[PDB]
Amino acid sequence: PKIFNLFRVCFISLLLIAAVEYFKYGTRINYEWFHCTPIKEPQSGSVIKLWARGGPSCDKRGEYKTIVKRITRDYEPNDEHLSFCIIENDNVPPVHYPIHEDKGEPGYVAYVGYDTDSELVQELCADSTIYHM
Amino acid sequence: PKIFNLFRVCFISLLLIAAVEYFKYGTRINYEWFHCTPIKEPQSGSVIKLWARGGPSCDKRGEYKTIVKRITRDYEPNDEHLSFCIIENDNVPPVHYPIHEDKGEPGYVAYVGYDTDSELVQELCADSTIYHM
Amino acid sequence: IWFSFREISYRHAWIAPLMILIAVYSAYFTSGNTTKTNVLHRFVAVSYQIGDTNAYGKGINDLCFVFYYMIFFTFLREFLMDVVIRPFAIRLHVTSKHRIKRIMEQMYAIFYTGVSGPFGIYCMYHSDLWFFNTKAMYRTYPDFTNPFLFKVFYLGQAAFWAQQACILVLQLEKPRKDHNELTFHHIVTLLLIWSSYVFHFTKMGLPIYITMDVSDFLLSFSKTLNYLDSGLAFFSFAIFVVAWIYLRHYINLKILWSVLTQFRTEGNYVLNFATQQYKCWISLPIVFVLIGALQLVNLYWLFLIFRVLYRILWR
Amino acid sequence: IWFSFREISYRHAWIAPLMILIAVYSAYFTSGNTTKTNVLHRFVAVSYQIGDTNAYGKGINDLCFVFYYMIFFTFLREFLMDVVIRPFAIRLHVTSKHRIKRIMEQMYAIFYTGVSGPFGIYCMYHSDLWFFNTKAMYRTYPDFTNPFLFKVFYLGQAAFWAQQACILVLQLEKPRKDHNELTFHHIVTLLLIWSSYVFHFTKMGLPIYITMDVSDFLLSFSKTLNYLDSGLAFFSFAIFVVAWIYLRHYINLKILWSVLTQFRTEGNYVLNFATQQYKCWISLPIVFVLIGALQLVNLYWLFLIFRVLYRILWR
Ligand SMILES: CCCCCCCCCCCCCCCCCCCCCCCCCC(=O)N[C@@H](C)[C@@H](O)C[C@H](O)CCCC[C@@H](O)C[C@H](C)C[C@H](OC(=O)C[C@@H](CC(=O)O)C(=O)O)[C@H](OC(=O)C[C@@H](CC(=O)O)C(=O)O)[C@H](C)CCCC
Ligand SMILES: CCCCCCCCCCCCCCCCCCCCCCCCCC(=O)N[C@@H](C)[C@@H](O)C[C@H](O)CCCC[C@@H](O)C[C@H](C)C[C@H](OC(=O)C[C@@H](CC(=O)O)C(=O)O)[C@H](OC(=O)C[C@@H](CC(=O)O)C(=O)O)[C@H](C)CCCC
C-alpha cells in the first residue's frame, strides 16, 4: 500500500497539468512574442522607427503590442521624458502577412524619441497625434 | 568530505540568486501590474472607458501600458474586429498621482468597442485618431 | 464501530467509496438548484455548457468531474467484482487461485468494455467521423467544444484509466507478474488522453478509444472462454486475432499515415497561439511519436499473439 | 606523477588552488587587451565601470569575480596557515592538539581581520558615512553604483564568507564542536551580504562589516594571548569586552533604531518597481528581522562573555 508513491505521482501529474495549462494561457496572452519580431530603424540621434513583421499570426493587434512593448521597454521616462506616435496602415486588413518572406508593408509603424530631440519626432510624424510619456 | 552536500547547497543558492534577479527584472519591466489598477466604465452596448489609477509610481507610461493591455486582452479581434482611441491629458505631468485616495484626473483614457458599434466610438472619441485592430 | 468498519473495509473494499458517492449524491439531489449554480454540480455533472446548445467547453470542473468519477469507478470495480462475479465464478466449476483471479479480472474487463465500446461507436455514429473517416478528424480542428455524450464518454474513459493507473501505483498485489511493459503502456495511455483533451484533439482520439475497446472486449471474451475450459475458445481466439489485426494495426497505421499526410492538408496548418491553433509542424512529431509508441506496444503484443498461435499450431 | 600529486594535495591542500590561480593570472597577463574586452577580466577584476568615472555597476561578472576569489581565499587560507603559522606556532612553546589547532585558527583570523578592518574603515572614511552616520546610510538610497575600493571590499568580504560557508558544508573536520548556532550565523551572514548587494543596501551594510571586523580582531587577539599563556591576556580581554559592547551592541542598536526611524524619513520611501526603489513599508520588516537576528546571535555571545567574566571574577 504505497500511499506516498500515489501521492507523489498525483502531485507530479497535477504540476504537469498546471504547467501545460499555464503554457497555453501564457502563449495565448503573450502570442506576439512568438509571432512578431520587432524591426528597429534608427533615423537620427535618439529617434528610431518601430514595426513588427511575422506570418499571418502577426496581426495588427500583435504589431501594436510589439511596438508599445518596445517603446515602453527600450526608453526610460524617469531618466528623460520621451515622445512617440503610432501610425496605422489603413490600406491593409488586420490579418495581412503571408507565410513566405515577402510581406509588403506593416500595419503599424512608430517613431520614438527623447524630448531632447522632439522636433524630429514632430516633423517625422506628419499629422498623427504625438503621445508623451 | 560531503561533496554532494556542497553541490546541493551551491545549486540551491544559485537558484535563490536567479529567482531574486528574475523577481527584480520582472517587477521592473511589469511594474504597472503592481502600481496601476485598471478602472473600466461601460458606456453603452459593447463599448467601455479605460484608465488606470495608482500612486506616484503609476506614471503616464504605466497608464498607457495598463490601458493597452486591457484593450488587447479583453477584446478578441479574431471573433470580431474592434476599434479604440487613446486620449491624453496634456494638462498633467507624467508623474501626477498622490499617495492618498484623492487623485484627480488620469493621464490617459481610452474608449474601446467592437465594430458592431463603431459609430459610438467614433462620436465618443471627439477628434482623436481611432485605431483598428 | 471502529472494529466493525475495519472488518468491513477489509472484506468489502467498496464500502468507503460507496459512502462517499452516496453522501455526495444525496447532498446534491436533496437540495434546490440542481443546475450549474450548485457546488456539487462540478463533481456530479459535466460543466461549461455553451449557452443552451449541445456543446460543452473545458475548464477545471473537468478535473473535479474526473476525480469524482475516479472515486465512482473505484467503487464500481470492487462492488461489481465481488458481489456479482463471486457468485458467478463460484457456481461455475473453477477451482484454483490463478484461474479465479484472472477470470475475475477478465469478466470485469468484459463488462466495462461491453459498456464502453458500443458507447464509443454510438458517439462516432452521430458525427462525421463515421467509419473511421480521417478527414473529419482534422477539418474543424480547434474544437474547443464537445457534445454532451462525447464529453461524458471522453472524461469517463479518462477517469477509468486514471483509476487504473493509481491502482497500479498504490500496489495491493504482487507486482512481479511477468508483463512490465504495462506500466509504460499506462503512462502512454494517460498522456494520450490528457494531451488529446487539453490540446483539442478529441475527435482524433475517439477512433483509438473505439479500436482499443473492441479489441479488449474480444480478447477478454477469448481469455474467459479459455479459463472455463470450453473448447469453443479457439474459434473466439481466431475471431479475436482477425479483429485485433484489423482494428488495431490496419486502422492505427491508417491513422498514423493520416497524421503524416492530412495533418498538413486538412484544416488549418498555420500555427496561431492567439487562436489556440496548435496543429502545425511542431506538434506533428509529438502526435506521431505518441501514437507510434502506442503502436509499438501493440506490435509487441501482436508478436506474443503470433507466438501463442505458433504453439497452438505445432502443439 | 599521480602518486606525487596525491601526496602533495594531502600534505599541502593549497597546491591545487595555487595552480588554478597561477594559470588564470598567467593567461590573463600574458596577453594583449587586459581591459574589459578579455574573457578573464570578469574573473580577475571587477566589471561594469560606469564610463570612466569611479563608480561600478552590478551584473553576473560580479558572480564570476566572487567565485574566482572564493578559489583565491581557499588558496590563501591553506598556504598562509601552513607555511607561516606552522613555523611561528612551533617555534613558540605550544604543546598540544587543541591549543595548536585553535592558535592556528585565531592567528589566521587575526591576519585576515587586520587586513579587512582598516580597509573597511578607510572605505567609510572617504564617504559621508563617516563615523557611523546613519543618515548618509539612507539619503541617496537606490545606489546602483559603488566606488572601486568599496565594491572590491564588499565583494572580497562576500567571497571570503562564501568560502567559509562552503568549508562549513564540505566538512573536513569533526563537526561536533559545542557551538552550533554558528551555522545559523553563517546563513544569516551570507543572506545579509547577498541581499544587501542585490537590493542596493551596500552603504547600509558597510558599518556592519566594520563593527564585526574590529570585534573579531580584538577577540582573536585576546584568545591568542590566552593560548600562549601570557598573563597579559586579561587586559586584552577587558579591552575586547568594552569594544565588543560598544561596537556591536551600541552601534547595532543605533542602526536598528535608525531603520525604524530614518528608513521612513530619509530619502525616498515610496515604492517604485520601475526605478528599483525598494525602500518602503514592505522591506522595513525584512531589514529589521535580518539585523535583529544578527543582533540576537550577538547577544547570545555577549551572555557567554559575561559568563566567562563571572567565572574569572569568582575563580
Ligand atoms: C505548438 C506547440 C503545441 C503542442 C501541441 C502538442 C499536442 C499533443 C499531441 C496531441 C495528441 C493526440 C493523440 C490522439 C489520440 C487520442 C487517444 C485517446 C485515448 C486512446 C488511448 C486508449 C488506451 C487503450 C489501450 C489499451 O486498452 N491497452 C490494454 C488493452 C493493454 O494494456 C492490454 C492488452 O489487451 C494486452 C494484450 C496481450 C495479449 C496476450 O496476452 C495474448 C496471449 C499471448 C494469448 C492469450 O493470453 C494468454 O497467454 C493467457 C496467459 C495470460 C498471460 O499472458 O499472463 C495465462 O495463461 O494466464 C492466451 O494464451 C494462452 O494461454 C494459450 C495457452 C494454451 C494454448 O495455446 O494451447 C498456451 O499456449 O500456453 C490465448 C487466448 C489462449 C486461447 C487458446 C485457444
Ligand atoms: C518591495 C520588496 C523588495 C524587497 C527588499 C528587501 C531587501 C532585503 C533587505 C536588505 C538587507 C540590508 C541589510 C544591511 C546589512 C548588510 C550586512 C553586510 C555584511 C555584514 C555581515 C558580516 C558578518 C560578520 C559576523 C561575524 O563576524 N561573526 C563571527 C564573529 C562569529 O561567528 C564568531 C564570534 O566572534 C564568536 C564570539 C564568541 C565569544 C566567546 O567564545 C568568548 C568566550 C566565552 C571567552 C573566550 O573564549 C573561550 O571561551 C575559549 C574557549 C573557546 C570556545 O568557546 O570553545 C576555549 O577554551 O577553547 C575565553 O574564555 C576562556 O577560555 C576563559 C577560561 C579561563 C578563565 O576565564 O579563567 C575559562 O574561564 O574557562 C576568554 C577570552 C579567555 C581569556 C582569559 C582572560
PDB file of C-alpha atoms in Angstrom, chain D residues 35-181:
ATOM      1  CA  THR D  35      40.782  45.624 -20.206  1.00  0.00           C
ATOM      2  CA  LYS D  36      37.119  44.542 -20.065  1.00  0.00           C
ATOM      3  CA  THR D  37      37.353  43.017 -23.554  1.00  0.00           C
ATOM      4  CA  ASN D  38      39.190  39.980 -22.157  1.00  0.00           C
ATOM      5  CA  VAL D  39      37.243  36.939 -21.009  1.00  0.00           C
ATOM      6  CA  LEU D  40      39.413  36.527 -17.893  1.00  0.00           C
ATOM      7  CA  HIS D  41      38.764  40.121 -16.811  1.00  0.00           C
ATOM      8  CA  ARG D  42      35.369  39.198 -15.360  1.00  0.00           C
ATOM      9  CA  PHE D  43      37.201  36.826 -13.003  1.00  0.00           C
ATOM     10  CA  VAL D  44      40.365  38.778 -12.218  1.00  0.00           C
ATOM     11  CA  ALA D  45      38.816  42.253 -11.907  1.00  0.00           C
ATOM     12  CA  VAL D  46      35.548  43.978 -11.049  1.00  0.00           C
ATOM     13  CA  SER D  47      33.452  44.854 -14.090  1.00  0.00           C
ATOM     14  CA  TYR D  48      30.689  47.303 -15.092  1.00  0.00           C
ATOM     15  CA  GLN D  49      32.623  50.546 -14.789  1.00  0.00           C
ATOM     16  CA  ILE D  50      30.275  53.456 -15.481  1.00  0.00           C
ATOM     17  CA  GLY D  51      32.070  55.310 -18.274  1.00  0.00           C
ATOM     18  CA  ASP D  52      35.473  56.393 -16.951  1.00  0.00           C
ATOM     19  CA  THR D  53      34.415  57.685 -13.535  1.00  0.00           C
ATOM     20  CA  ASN D  54      34.868  55.953 -10.167  1.00  0.00           C
ATOM     21  CA  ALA D  55      31.567  54.081  -9.831  1.00  0.00           C
ATOM     22  CA  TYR D  56      30.863  50.469 -10.750  1.00  0.00           C
ATOM     23  CA  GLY D  57      27.638  48.725 -11.634  1.00  0.00           C
ATOM     24  CA  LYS D  58      26.280  45.259 -10.946  1.00  0.00           C
ATOM     25  CA  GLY D  59      25.833  42.145 -13.059  1.00  0.00           C
ATOM     26  CA  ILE D  60      26.876  38.494 -13.438  1.00  0.00           C
ATOM     27  CA  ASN D  61      30.604  39.184 -13.696  1.00  0.00           C
ATOM     28  CA  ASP D  62      30.124  40.002 -10.013  1.00  0.00           C
ATOM     29  CA  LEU D  63      29.285  36.319  -9.508  1.00  0.00           C
ATOM     30  CA  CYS D  64      32.303  35.350 -11.606  1.00  0.00           C
ATOM     31  CA  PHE D  65      34.585  37.595  -9.518  1.00  0.00           C
ATOM     32  CA  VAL D  66      33.133  36.226  -6.273  1.00  0.00           C
ATOM     33  CA  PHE D  67      33.686  32.628  -7.403  1.00  0.00           C
ATOM     34  CA  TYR D  68      37.254  33.222  -8.563  1.00  0.00           C
ATOM     35  CA  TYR D  69      38.131  34.899  -5.291  1.00  0.00           C
ATOM     36  CA  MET D  70      36.477  32.099  -3.346  1.00  0.00           C
ATOM     37  CA  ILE D  71      39.133  29.994  -5.051  1.00  0.00           C
ATOM     38  CA  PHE D  72      41.742  32.620  -4.147  1.00  0.00           C
ATOM     39  CA  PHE D  73      40.742  32.676  -0.466  1.00  0.00           C
ATOM     40  CA  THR D  74      40.749  28.874  -0.406  1.00  0.00           C
ATOM     41  CA  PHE D  75      44.349  29.039  -1.610  1.00  0.00           C
ATOM     42  CA  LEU D  76      45.337  31.816   0.790  1.00  0.00           C
ATOM     43  CA  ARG D  77      43.834  30.166   3.875  1.00  0.00           C
ATOM     44  CA  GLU D  78      45.747  26.913   3.480  1.00  0.00           C
ATOM     45  CA  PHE D  79      49.003  28.368   2.132  1.00  0.00           C
ATOM     46  CA  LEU D  80      49.308  31.148   4.697  1.00  0.00           C
ATOM     47  CA  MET D  81      48.144  28.939   7.567  1.00  0.00           C
ATOM     48  CA  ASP D  82      50.620  26.150   6.853  1.00  0.00           C
ATOM     49  CA  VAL D  83      53.701  27.948   5.563  1.00  0.00           C
ATOM     50  CA  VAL D  84      53.646  30.848   8.022  1.00  0.00           C
ATOM     51  CA  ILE D  85      51.850  29.685  11.166  1.00  0.00           C
ATOM     52  CA  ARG D  86      53.495  26.255  11.328  1.00  0.00           C
ATOM     53  CA  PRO D  87      56.950  27.784  11.930  1.00  0.00           C
ATOM     54  CA  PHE D  88      55.538  30.550  14.146  1.00  0.00           C
ATOM     55  CA  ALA D  89      53.353  28.271  16.282  1.00  0.00           C
ATOM     56  CA  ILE D  90      56.112  25.638  16.573  1.00  0.00           C
ATOM     57  CA  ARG D  91      58.986  27.994  17.481  1.00  0.00           C
ATOM     58  CA  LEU D  92      56.559  29.131  20.188  1.00  0.00           C
ATOM     59  CA  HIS D  93      56.292  26.618  23.026  1.00  0.00           C
ATOM     60  CA  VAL D  94      52.733  25.441  22.447  1.00  0.00           C
ATOM     61  CA  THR D  95      52.452  21.716  23.124  1.00  0.00           C
ATOM     62  CA  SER D  96      49.002  20.271  22.477  1.00  0.00           C
ATOM     63  CA  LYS D  97      46.449  19.405  19.795  1.00  0.00           C
ATOM     64  CA  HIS D  98      43.553  21.667  20.757  1.00  0.00           C
ATOM     65  CA  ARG D  99      45.957  24.503  21.542  1.00  0.00           C
ATOM     66  CA  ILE D 100      47.776  24.212  18.209  1.00  0.00           C
ATOM     67  CA  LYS D 101      44.578  23.958  16.137  1.00  0.00           C
ATOM     68  CA  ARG D 102      42.912  26.926  17.801  1.00  0.00           C
ATOM     69  CA  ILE D 103      46.052  29.081  17.763  1.00  0.00           C
ATOM     70  CA  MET D 104      46.185  28.222  14.047  1.00  0.00           C
ATOM     71  CA  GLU D 105      42.611  29.392  13.500  1.00  0.00           C
ATOM     72  CA  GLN D 106      42.844  32.524  15.641  1.00  0.00           C
ATOM     73  CA  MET D 107      46.125  33.704  14.129  1.00  0.00           C
ATOM     74  CA  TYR D 108      44.657  33.341  10.641  1.00  0.00           C
ATOM     75  CA  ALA D 109      41.598  35.279  11.816  1.00  0.00           C
ATOM     76  CA  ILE D 110      43.882  37.965  13.259  1.00  0.00           C
ATOM     77  CA  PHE D 111      45.678  38.317   9.918  1.00  0.00           C
ATOM     78  CA  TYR D 112      42.540  38.458   7.779  1.00  0.00           C
ATOM     79  CA  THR D 113      40.739  40.848  10.095  1.00  0.00           C
ATOM     80  CA  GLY D 114      43.782  43.091  10.470  1.00  0.00           C
ATOM     81  CA  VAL D 115      43.706  43.398   6.693  1.00  0.00           C
ATOM     82  CA  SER D 116      39.946  43.828   6.297  1.00  0.00           C
ATOM     83  CA  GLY D 117      39.144  46.104   9.248  1.00  0.00           C
ATOM     84  CA  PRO D 118      41.305  49.108   8.423  1.00  0.00           C
ATOM     85  CA  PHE D 119      40.310  48.543   4.801  1.00  0.00           C
ATOM     86  CA  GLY D 120      36.649  48.993   5.707  1.00  0.00           C
ATOM     87  CA  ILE D 121      37.427  51.972   7.932  1.00  0.00           C
ATOM     88  CA  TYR D 122      39.301  53.570   5.022  1.00  0.00           C
ATOM     89  CA  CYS D 123      36.316  52.932   2.737  1.00  0.00           C
ATOM     90  CA  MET D 124      33.987  54.538   5.302  1.00  0.00           C
ATOM     91  CA  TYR D 125      36.432  57.440   5.768  1.00  0.00           C
ATOM     92  CA  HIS D 126      36.226  58.562   2.125  1.00  0.00           C
ATOM     93  CA  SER D 127      32.424  58.796   2.164  1.00  0.00           C
ATOM     94  CA  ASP D 128      29.736  60.682   4.079  1.00  0.00           C
ATOM     95  CA  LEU D 129      29.142  57.676   6.293  1.00  0.00           C
ATOM     96  CA  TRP D 130      31.939  58.940   8.400  1.00  0.00           C
ATOM     97  CA  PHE D 131      31.522  57.918  11.802  1.00  0.00           C
ATOM     98  CA  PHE D 132      28.717  55.830  11.733  1.00  0.00           C
ATOM     99  CA  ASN D 133      26.434  58.456  10.442  1.00  0.00           C
ATOM    100  CA  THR D 134      23.115  56.766   9.810  1.00  0.00           C
ATOM    101  CA  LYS D 135      21.563  59.472   7.616  1.00  0.00           C
ATOM    102  CA  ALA D 136      24.094  59.147   4.780  1.00  0.00           C
ATOM    103  CA  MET D 137      23.147  55.471   5.098  1.00  0.00           C
ATOM    104  CA  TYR D 138      19.726  56.354   3.617  1.00  0.00           C
ATOM    105  CA  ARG D 139      19.839  59.728   1.808  1.00  0.00           C
ATOM    106  CA  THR D 140      20.821  58.588  -1.699  1.00  0.00           C
ATOM    107  CA  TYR D 141      19.182  55.173  -1.427  1.00  0.00           C
ATOM    108  CA  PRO D 142      18.884  53.471  -4.828  1.00  0.00           C
ATOM    109  CA  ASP D 143      22.717  53.369  -5.099  1.00  0.00           C
ATOM    110  CA  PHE D 144      23.035  51.322  -8.284  1.00  0.00           C
ATOM    111  CA  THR D 145      26.783  52.051  -8.444  1.00  0.00           C
ATOM    112  CA  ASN D 146      29.587  51.689  -5.905  1.00  0.00           C
ATOM    113  CA  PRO D 147      33.138  53.073  -5.941  1.00  0.00           C
ATOM    114  CA  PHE D 148      36.084  50.900  -6.917  1.00  0.00           C
ATOM    115  CA  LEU D 149      37.506  50.247  -3.453  1.00  0.00           C
ATOM    116  CA  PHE D 150      34.034  49.982  -1.931  1.00  0.00           C
ATOM    117  CA  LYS D 151      32.996  47.339  -4.470  1.00  0.00           C
ATOM    118  CA  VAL D 152      36.199  45.297  -4.247  1.00  0.00           C
ATOM    119  CA  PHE D 153      35.990  45.357  -0.446  1.00  0.00           C
ATOM    120  CA  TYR D 154      32.322  44.353  -0.459  1.00  0.00           C
ATOM    121  CA  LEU D 155      32.810  41.505  -2.923  1.00  0.00           C
ATOM    122  CA  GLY D 156      36.011  40.302  -1.248  1.00  0.00           C
ATOM    123  CA  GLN D 157      34.095  40.037   2.011  1.00  0.00           C
ATOM    124  CA  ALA D 158      31.369  38.149   0.149  1.00  0.00           C
ATOM    125  CA  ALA D 159      33.915  35.739  -1.370  1.00  0.00           C
ATOM    126  CA  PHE D 160      35.648  35.157   1.976  1.00  0.00           C
ATOM    127  CA  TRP D 161      32.397  34.406   3.781  1.00  0.00           C
ATOM    128  CA  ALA D 162      31.107  32.223   0.939  1.00  0.00           C
ATOM    129  CA  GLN D 163      34.313  30.194   1.141  1.00  0.00           C
ATOM    130  CA  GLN D 164      33.888  29.901   4.917  1.00  0.00           C
ATOM    131  CA  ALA D 165      30.338  28.636   4.395  1.00  0.00           C
ATOM    132  CA  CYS D 166      31.319  26.072   1.760  1.00  0.00           C
ATOM    133  CA  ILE D 167      34.088  24.806   4.041  1.00  0.00           C
ATOM    134  CA  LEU D 168      31.470  24.520   6.781  1.00  0.00           C
ATOM    135  CA  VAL D 169      29.285  22.481   4.401  1.00  0.00           C
ATOM    136  CA  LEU D 170      32.012  20.353   2.795  1.00  0.00           C
ATOM    137  CA  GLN D 171      33.217  19.047   6.134  1.00  0.00           C
ATOM    138  CA  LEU D 172      36.872  18.159   6.661  1.00  0.00           C
ATOM    139  CA  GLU D 173      36.779  18.181  10.461  1.00  0.00           C
ATOM    140  CA  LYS D 174      34.874  16.764  13.423  1.00  0.00           C
ATOM    141  CA  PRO D 175      31.752  18.903  13.381  1.00  0.00           C
ATOM    142  CA  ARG D 176      30.540  18.365  16.968  1.00  0.00           C
ATOM    143  CA  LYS D 177      32.395  21.373  18.357  1.00  0.00           C
ATOM    144  CA  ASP D 178      29.926  22.541  21.013  1.00  0.00           C
ATOM    145  CA  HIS D 179      28.824  25.697  19.169  1.00  0.00           C
ATOM    146  CA  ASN D 180      26.195  25.015  16.520  1.00  0.00           C
ATOM    147  CA  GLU D 181      24.496  28.384  16.336  1.00  0.00           C
TER     148      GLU D 181
END
